[PDB]
Amino acid sequence: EIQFLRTDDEVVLQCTATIHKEQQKLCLAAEGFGNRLCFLESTSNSKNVPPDLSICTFVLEQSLSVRALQEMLAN
């Protein structure tokens, strides 16, 4: 009944802002071409300004354990 985040699923990372006693919802965005630095795209003001979700989505490839990751990195 409750869905589980599984690998190969496309997701967006959202964080909440409490600036000046206002709940602002922001997503983690990055433009791979050009500036590699990540920035935030606001999604709480979708009524006034459309969010650019095209560059805020990530795909979860692997969910290896810590020990399995260490063995990966050793080998």
- The answer to whether 43 touches 27, Cβ cutoff 8 Å, is yes
Token pair listed for 15:
């964080």
Token pair listed for 50:
């459309």
Structure resolution, Å: 3.1
- The answer to whether 23 touches 29, Cβ cutoff 8 Å, is no
Which strands sit side by side in the sheet containing 39-42, from one edge to the other?
A: 14-17, 24-29, 39-42
Solved with: cryo-EM
